[PDB]
Amino acid sequence: ASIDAQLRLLVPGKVSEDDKLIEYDALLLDKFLDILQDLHGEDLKEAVQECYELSAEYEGKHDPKKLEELGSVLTSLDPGDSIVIAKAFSHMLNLANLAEEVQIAYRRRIKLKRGDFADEANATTESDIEETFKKLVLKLNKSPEEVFDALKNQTVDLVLTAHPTQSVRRSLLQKHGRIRNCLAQLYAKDITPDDKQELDEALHREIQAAFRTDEIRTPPTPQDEMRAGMSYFHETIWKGVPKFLRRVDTALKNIGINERVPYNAPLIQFSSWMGGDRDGNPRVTPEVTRDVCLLARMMASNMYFSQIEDLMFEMSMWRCNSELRVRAEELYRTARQVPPTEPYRVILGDVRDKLYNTRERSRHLLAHGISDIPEEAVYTNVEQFLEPLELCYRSLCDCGDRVIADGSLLDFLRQVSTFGLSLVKLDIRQESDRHTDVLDAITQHLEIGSYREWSEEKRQEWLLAELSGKRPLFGSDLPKTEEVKDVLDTFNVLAELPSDCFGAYIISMATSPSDVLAVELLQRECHVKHPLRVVPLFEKLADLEAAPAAMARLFSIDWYRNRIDGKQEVMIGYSDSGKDAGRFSAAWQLYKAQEEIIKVAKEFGVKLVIFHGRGGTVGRGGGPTHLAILSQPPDTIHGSLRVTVQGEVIEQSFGEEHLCFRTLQRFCAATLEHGMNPPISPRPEWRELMDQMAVVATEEYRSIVFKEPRFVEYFRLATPELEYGRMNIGSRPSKGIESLRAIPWIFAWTQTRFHLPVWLGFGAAFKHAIKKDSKNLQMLQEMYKTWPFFRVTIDLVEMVFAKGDPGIAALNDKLLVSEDLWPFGESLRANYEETKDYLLKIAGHRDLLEGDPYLKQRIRLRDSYITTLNVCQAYTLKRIRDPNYHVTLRPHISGLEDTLILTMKGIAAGMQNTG
Amino acid sequence: ASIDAQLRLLVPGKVSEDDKLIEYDALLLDKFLDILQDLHGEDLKEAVQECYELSAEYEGKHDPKKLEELGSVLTSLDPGDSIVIAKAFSHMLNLANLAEEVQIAYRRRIKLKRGDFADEANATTESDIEETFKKLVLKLNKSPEEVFDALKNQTVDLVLTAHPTQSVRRSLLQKHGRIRNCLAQLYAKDITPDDKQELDEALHREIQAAFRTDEIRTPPTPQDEMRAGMSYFHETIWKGVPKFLRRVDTALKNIGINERVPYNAPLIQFSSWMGGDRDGNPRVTPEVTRDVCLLARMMASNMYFSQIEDLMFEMSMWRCNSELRVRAEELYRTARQVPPTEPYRVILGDVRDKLYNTRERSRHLLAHGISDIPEEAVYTNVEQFLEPLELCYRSLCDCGDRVIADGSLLDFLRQVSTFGLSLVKLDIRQESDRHTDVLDAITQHLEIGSYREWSEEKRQEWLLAELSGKRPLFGSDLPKTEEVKDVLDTFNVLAELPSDCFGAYIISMATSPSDVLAVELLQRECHVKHPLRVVPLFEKLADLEAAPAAMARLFSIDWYRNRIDGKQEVMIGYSDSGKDAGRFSAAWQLYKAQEEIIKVAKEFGVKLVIFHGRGGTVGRGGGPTHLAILSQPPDTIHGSLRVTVQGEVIEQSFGEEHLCFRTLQRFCAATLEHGMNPPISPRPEWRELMDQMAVVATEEYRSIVFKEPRFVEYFRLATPELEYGRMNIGSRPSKGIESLRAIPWIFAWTQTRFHLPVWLGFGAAFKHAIKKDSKNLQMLQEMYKTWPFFRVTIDLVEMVFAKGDPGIAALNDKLLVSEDLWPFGESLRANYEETKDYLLKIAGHRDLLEGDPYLKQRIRLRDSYITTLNVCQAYTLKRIRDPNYHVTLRPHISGLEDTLILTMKGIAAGMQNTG
Ligand SMILES: N[C@@H](CC(=O)O)C(=O)O
Ligand SMILES: N[C@@H](CC(=O)O)C(=O)O
């Protein structure tokens, strides 16, 4: 009641019977405090309470003295007390996030709505799959048969990637899951009062179990990181896929199509980078890739094996067609155990043994390299596994029992067909220099010169000479650095392993046609019988500008064209390009890049798939992902969406089963709509203005980030990037700021609540547009109201500002940055304010997130917890870095490195996605 | 809407937001009809509809022409159409029962209540475990510590037995389960509208799946029947036990006891007869018993194996006491796979392998008699399995994490401790003649005479001479009939198998102390190292009268007394005794028998457990079971309830998880209360009247059932007992009416809706009480209002009359019984009416079940469906029995033996428990 009133003082809540977020947080906190008291004593609970209040008062008034009050309580803790408190706030934050998931899961959809594109920006107002169908028939004049057709031919490929600050352990998500479920159920109307006393107890227990699953730090092998990343299949994706496909079927009945999506239409696919991306990451070896492909194969076949047992129980029926009868009797005769009066079980029992075999073979190969289990007794292609299930389906329909075939059996065909034999196909990624090195080692060995030195024309001439050559390039004889051996051994792994383990070979830092032709040649020479498609990733602005020419050249080369069989994937990386030119300029350039590359594809009759890498507005998750997809340039999806699911977004997207369902839904709805309903194309005046604004934006960003000689120094002091690197959480930080990687660049500035990488340059751009011609404000405002790409671009920056607090960034300056650099920090904070102000005026908003109060509330509630972690972090950095700084310790109330790891992860759990 | 209005015409429904039964039936029927139409054509659906209406109109007005209208539609069906219709009505009946389960599961408990013993007769008003605790502290002056103590020392042993008309297949219960769950959920307030379209579809599908799981008839091996009987463990009992124990814990916190029931207090146990009872059943061989003990061991260890995997996921914690640390490091060193930083998982992984081993060993022995798996690598005693789990519990509590130990780990300790290594312990039962035969074979072989011929005194003298003898009785050399070999081989199975597989050896038709001493000797001579306790089952009235003397003698014999170690179980069988003297007389005799046997036990200082066999008021299930227990004679439970769970009641008791929980609850609540709050003891006037009424009751019943020379003839014509026997559904029917077994006797008369065995004799008794002295009516009425035993006895008979329809029994006469026997049937129907009338006047009721409208409604709703099956059955019996009877067939609209099997099972599914 006091806990609830202090929260409601912080948030002016709402009457909606939906809105219980604050109640959820009160309850969770109250239980958590009780637990703290039981485990660590009243005084420790009191201290946690004291710190929380101080944070609350700060998020209220923003009096900066409150940060120093909190500081003086935090700096006065022996390191054992400091760990327990940083762990409390970390856990309260996670709890807050779980409460949010429950709130979003059960919030009521809004019945009356305008049916304009703004509705698509929020879960509560966005279109579901039936609404999208109906919209397409009614407002775009499509026959249902046409909508059905588009949908059958559509793919959405979600690509899973490493969590930047380490993935949650599988057992911790299950606990989280149980906390959510207890929370949901304590407010259910369907369960009575005494059933609930036990839920209170179950919830209290589960909050404690999660708290005491807290071992710390050798951060984990890439194999271990991959396993943890794959957790969401068991948690929600495995059931969610069939569940969502069944909804599609209902939407279809409701617009007059009586059929179901064929079970083998590949509407949904998952891919993975985990153990495949080695770009600037030498822990990801050849052996690691070999491993994760075996683990994928193992996990998958373990899931099918376990599920088929349930299916077998259900399939008790005795009526079959003669085709199944024949097959059953054969298998029964090999009488090596069910009755023949249960024919479906005879077939499925045989499939079960193959699955078990497929699973042991994989485990053996992982543990030893050898299996006594022969490939003949195992599944090596997904069609071998589908065939007998197709036979069951047919047999049931033939006997008049389609309605039964359409239950669990149909769910299973869809699972098999969506997940295939692994659950995910692995992309490989490596940077083009590393290919050039391999090729230079070869040219020097052959005594024909230095490939590195050759011009792009000469490279091409030679690479095409070898790709039509009749003669192998090199052997094992070849003298290799370690790095060159690593690239070759990777290709050997691709040659040994089956082609259903893989998808794309992504070339980082791609710039030329030779970049792609080099990988094609290496694949062929390493004897990859079925080469992975090669996908260039264009990173720098200059690189995006030349991309279209590069693709024109590739497509005009007979060998490549033939090889590519009318399909090409190109990858873009928003964070990467933004690190080179600033976010605004990169946003515009990538809109144009996509138009231009699509144009070139059309001209050569090549189907082009744009693979969205991290940092884009489609990575946000939730409603915003819906409008983001709808806002893609015309024809840039054309039935194939490939998109990165950022690790810092996966829990929110897929952890809770309703949210998982809505994620799959919105990816399908928006893809289908876009291909038939592109957004409006910009007015010429808008394009002109965007070009002008980009030039200015880029000049601002670059002068600060690359031309200010003391910038890197400032960045290393104000920011924990050096300590992120040295306590490496994941990869490793540089390969100056050109050299630093995207993820560390975003993470450094997110941790100080300043977020420079997201907003810098927007201010110069808007300021200059408006001084040049006051009318530009109105145009900028009109662009916001009517151009989806622009709306969505501003919305993401607005959201990032909501997560911003220049107070916190000033505290880091004060504590960590030398006095000579303070005016620099201060000018950067002046830039923040100005940039924000312009963003607000363009959006027509007085405060941040006025258009999105549900998001506003969520963020404001987390901020109490994050803020404590930020203060703790700031003063801990001061203690680690400065031996001259000492501060008197309280007597014990219930290892600075440990505290810092804890705060870095917490602030990352709290900030989730930004840029 | 038309379907719903025709149902509501049949039942004057109610406003309660609870009461949705009629809606549930409308929905289920509407879907079912759609399915029938899809599978068999509009005309077949129409015919089913036509028959249902006719039945409806009959249950409305009771115009007997409607039965013949239905007859003429049913007799005019080719046998393929007849099968499909009998199957429709069978399925509609099952559906009705599923709807009932959902209605009972979610009906609201009544808050305001008198707190007299009548409240305990209904689920809605009965006391839960907290109410019972509070009652005992408040109204009986017990300290909570005393109540806690009684409860720790209490056992309830539920003994599972064969379904009399064949157990439902395991896969069919799961389907049933899913129909219930879809039904519940379609009315949930917590799930929104679109989620529901899919439930409609899921329910329609599941009603169809159940319908097409319908293979017919070699009725099943006893092994197969046992497996099907054990289904309820997976379905609800496995989780229900821990769930109910946790409730007990909450009830305890709420009366001020801060502890939990120790995990190893044996509050709940299950036993089994399946594969153990061979009394008049030679399909139950030695080998069958060997088998079911192995299957029990296998199923159990399979469940523990699968559950421990979940537990292992949860037990991620790293803090342990040193005792667990030591053990973990040992196991890890035998490094033959988890990290040692996860000590609970190292311990539980080792337990998992033992469980897997325990499970393979059992399977091998079942399939071959030999296992390569040694007994050393397996669990052979439940304490070996508990010990490491106890170690986990302790370690968690020591480290401050009791709250975590009290979750899943505690659930698991309770499961292990409740179920032990098998899930159920097997009782053996055999009739005493068969022992006498064995002993006569021995005495003749030894050339000392004929044990059969010896007097009871001589038997005892000899059996005690051999039980103190120093010299074995016989070898393999012994000349044996097949029957005598079968008894010896059974005892050899008990000698070979471990003693945790077994419980009681029940002697059917027990009458003398030598009966029990004979089995003790046989056990010892067959080298059963740990002999099963021997339990006499007294069946005839005369036998119940001499029971107390028999037990006095046994207890006064030093050898037996020493052997028995202060514990003896005696079994009673209500149906059995009722077959000898009529229900009323048996009810009274067994009240007195129990008083007398308890008295004798007290005198000798022996703890006496009464084992309730079938047919008693405690077998009803639901609320009535609660009052039944409370009505036992004083001191006859004394902390140990052993009771039969009749197969025809198991689904209702345990199929749905709420009902399962309430079943366990009420057995605990009522047992605990009774031991501290016996019912009032009868007034002398009441005892006198009961004795007078019994003498008369017995004379009526016996003169009709045993002394009427044409009775057996009448019974064989009016009743399908001959066809129950010959199409044997289970056992086999006789060993005249003395010879016939209880179950067939009850089943024959239930099938004609006449139920003679339950009510015959009550009429003579009441009539005579009242003519003797008109005041006796008032006393009889007072007994009903204030003596629980009497209330409960009348209530069961009242319920049976609600299931009665003398119209149906008249139709069977008309069709099947020769005209010369019609006045006999008619006098029996006059007796029915008169008996009913008296029962109503005694109860203060104008109509049947006026005290229990919820039960009234349930029964009236089933009756529509049953009635069709009854008509179908009657005319099918006429066709099978009379080649001279032929009746013209409709052209086909979409095997008489098959139709009959179907109707017999349906009517049994519909009638459930009677006597
Ligand atoms: N993912 C949310 C922000 C957050 O939940 O942190 C959004 O992009 O709006
Ligand atoms: N078992 C119920 C009757 C029934 O459901 O058939 C009772 O004894 O009241």
Domain boundaries, chain A: 1-118+163-218+684-915, 119-162+219-683
A810 and A782 in contact (C-beta within 8 Å)? no
Separation between Cα atoms, residue A303 and residue A307, nearest integer Å:
6
HSE of A791 in the Cβ direction (CA atoms, 13 Å)? 24
| Cβ pair B207, B35 in contact under 8 A | yes
Q: Which residues of A touch B246 (CB under 8 A)?
A: 198
Compute the nearest-CA separation of A781 from chain B (Å).
38
In total, the C-beta contacts within 8 angstroms joining chain A to chain B are 94
The phi and psi torsions of A570 (rounded to 5 degrees) equal -125, 135
* Residues with Cβ within 8 Å of residue B49, at least 6 apart in sequence: B33
The vertex-B392 CA angle with B388 and B396, nearest 5°, equals 165
CB A804 within 8 A of CB A755: yes
Helices A583-603 and A684-702: crossing angle in degrees, nearest 10, is 130
Q: How far apart are CA B74 and CA B82, in angstroms?
A: 7
Q: Which residues approach ligand 1 with their CB closer than 6 A?
A: A 620-622, 624, 652, 799, 855, 912-913
Asked if A313's CB is within 8 angstroms of B205's CB, the reply is no
Distance from CA of A300 to the nearest CA of B (A): 18
Give the separation between CA B299 and CA A817, rounded to whole angstroms.
Answer: 68
Chain B nearest C-alpha distance from A877 (Å): 29
**DSSP per-residue letters across A116-164:** SGGGGGSTTTS--HHHHHHHHHHHS---HHHHHHHHHT-EEEEEE---T
Strands of B509-618 (E only): list them.
533-538, 567-572, 607-612
Distance of CA B746 to the CA centre of its chain: 15
- Residue B890 φ/ψ, nearest 5 degrees: -65, 150
Q: At residue A753, what is the residue type?
A: R
Which residues face B642 on adjacent strands? B157, B611
- Tokens 């305990």, located at residue: B120
Q: Which of A286, A230, A344 is nearest to A645 (CA)?
A: A230
- Strand partners of residue B425: B271
Nearest to B212 among A246, A319, A406 (CB): A319
Cβ neighbours of residue B741 closer than 8 Å, sequence gap 6 or more: B280, B731, B733, B734, B735
Backbone angles phi, psi at B7, to 5 degrees: -60, -45
**CA–CA separation, A770 and A766 (whole Å):** 6
**DSSP tag of B105:** H
Check if the beta carbon of residue A835 is closer than 8 Å to that of residue A763: yes
B855 touches ligand 2 (CB under 6 Å): yes
B540, B579, B638, B803: which one is catalytic? B579
User: Which residues in chain A are closer than 8 Å to B127, comparing Cβ atoms?
Assistant: none
For ligand 2, say whether the CB of B915 is within 6 Å of any of its atoms.
no
Q: What are phi and psi of A40, to 5 degrees?
A: -130, -5
Of A35, A190, A316, which is closest to B213 when you measure between CB atoms? Answer: A316
End-to-end CA distance of chain A: 38
Q: What is the DSSP code (8-state) at residue B107?
A: P
Residue numbers preceding breaks in chain A (C to N > 2.5 A): 217, 336, 735, 894
Contact A203, A179 (CB under 8 A): yes
**Which chain A residues are within 8 Å of B192, Cβ to Cβ?**
108
Residue-level length of chain B: 915
How far apart (Å, rounded) are the C-alpha atoms in residues A157 and B564?
A: 73
The residue whose CA has the least distance to atom 2 of ligand 2 is B620
Give the DSSP letter string of A660-704: HHHHHHHHHHHHHHHHHSPPPPPPHHHHHHHHHHHHHHHHHHHII
Interface residues of chain B, partner chain A, Cβ below 8 Å:
35, 38-39, 108, 128, 169-172, 174-175, 188-190, 192, 194, 197-198, 201-202, 204-206, 208-209, 212-213, 215, 246-247, 250, 313-314, 316-319, 341, 400-401, 403-404, 406-407
- In angstroms, what is the resolution? 2.7
- Exposed, middle or buried: residue B229 (CB in 10 Å: 0-12, 13-18, 19+)? buried
A502-508 vs B425-431, strand pairing mode: unpaired
Q: Which of B527, B468, A565 is nearest to B460 (CA)?
A: B468
The DSSP bridge partners found for residue A683 are none
Hunting for tokens 């509050």 — which residue is that? Answer: B267
Question: How far apart (Å, rounded) are the C-alpha atoms in residues A99 and A619?
Answer: 22
CB B504 within 8 A of CB B428: yes
Chain B residues inside the 8 Å CB shell of A35 = 403
In degrees, rounded to 5, the angle at the alpha carbon of residue B417 between the alpha carbons of residues B411 and B422 is 115
Which residue's CA is minimally distant from atom 6 of ligand 2?
B912
Q: Which residue has a Cα nearest atom 8 of ligand 1?
A: A620
Cβ(B646) to ligand 2 under 6 A? Answer: no
Give the DSSP H/E element, type plus range, for residue B268.
strand B268-272
Q: Closest ligand 1 atom, CA of A620?
A: 8
Ligand nearest to the CA of A909: 1
* CA-closest residue to ligand 1 atom 3: A913
B638 is catalytic: no
Contacts by A112-117 with C-beta closer than 8 Å and gap 24+? Answer: A117/A627, A117/A630, A117/A631, A117/A679, A117/A788, A117/A791
Q: Which of B116, B171, B244 is nearest to B786 (CA)?
A: B116
Give the residue from B752, B871, B891 showing the smallest Cα distance to B65: B871
Degrees to nearest 5, angle at CA A689 with A688 and A693: 125
Question: Letter for the amino acid at A747?
Answer: F
Asked if the Cβ–Cβ distance from B170 to A407 is below 8 Å, we say: no
Specify the DSSP class assigned to residue B234: I
B624 CB near ligand 2 (under 6 Å): yes
Beta bridge pairs of residue A272: A160, A426
Cβ atoms < 10 Å from Cβ of A89:
25
B264's enclosing H/E stretch is none
CA A419 to chain centre: 18
Q: Which of B108, B189, B407 sits opposite A189 (nearest CB)?
A: B189
* Angle between helix B806-816 and helix B711-718 axes, rounded to 10 deg: 100
Distance CA B259, CA B707 (A): 62
| Region class of B301: left (phi > 0), else alpha (psi between -120 and 50), else beta | alpha
3-state secondary structure of A631: coil
CA of B623 to the centre of ligand 2 (A): 10
Task: Answer whether B647 contacts ligand 2 (Cβ < 6 A).
Answer: no
Of B175, B400, B407, the CB nearest to A39: B400
Decide: B324 and B284 in contact? Cβ < 8 Å: no
Whether B755 contacts B745, CB under 8 Å: no
- Active-site pick, B163, B175, B638, B674: B163
Which residues are paired to A645 by β-bridges?
Answer: A160
Q: How far is the CA of A173 from the centre of ligand 1 (A)?
A: 20
Give kind and range of the element (H or E) at residue B18. none
Contacts of A175 in chain B (CB under 8 A): 314
Helix (H) or strand (E) holding B573: none
Q: How far is the CA of A488 from the centre of ligand 1 (A)?
A: 41
B55 vs B67: CA distance, rounded Å: 7
Cα A752 to ligand 1 centroid, rounded to whole Å: 18
A341–B215 C-beta distance less than 8 A: yes
Chain center to CA of B39: 36
* A interface test, pick of B316, B319, B320 with most A CB neighbours within 10 Å: B316
- The phi, psi pair for A691, rounded to 5°, reads -65, -45
Catalytic residues of A: 163, 579
Lookup result for tokens 């491993």: A291
Distance from CA of B200 to the nearest CA of A (A): 11
Location of structure tokens 């009791």: B402
Interface of A with B (CB under 8 A): 35, 38-39, 108, 128, 169-172, 174-175, 188-190, 192, 194, 197-198, 201-202, 204-206, 208-209, 212-213, 215, 246-247, 250, 313-314, 316-319, 341, 400-401, 403-404, 406-407
d(CA B417, CA B422): 11
Residue B317: which of A108, A213, A401 has the nearest Cβ? A213
* Cβ-based neighbour number of residue B93 at 10 Å: 21
Q: Do B250 and A198 touch (CB under 8 A)?
A: yes
Sign of CA pseudo-dihedral A190, A192, A197, A202: negative
Mutate to test the interface with B, among A36, A211, A245, A316 (most CBs of B within 10 A): A316
Which residue of B35, B128, B171 to mutate against A (max A Cβ within 10 Å)?
B171
CB hemisphere CA count around A317 (13 angstroms): 27
How far is Cα of residue A275 from the mean position of the Cα atoms in its chain?
Answer: 16
Ligand 1 centroid, distance to A133 Cα (angstroms) = 28
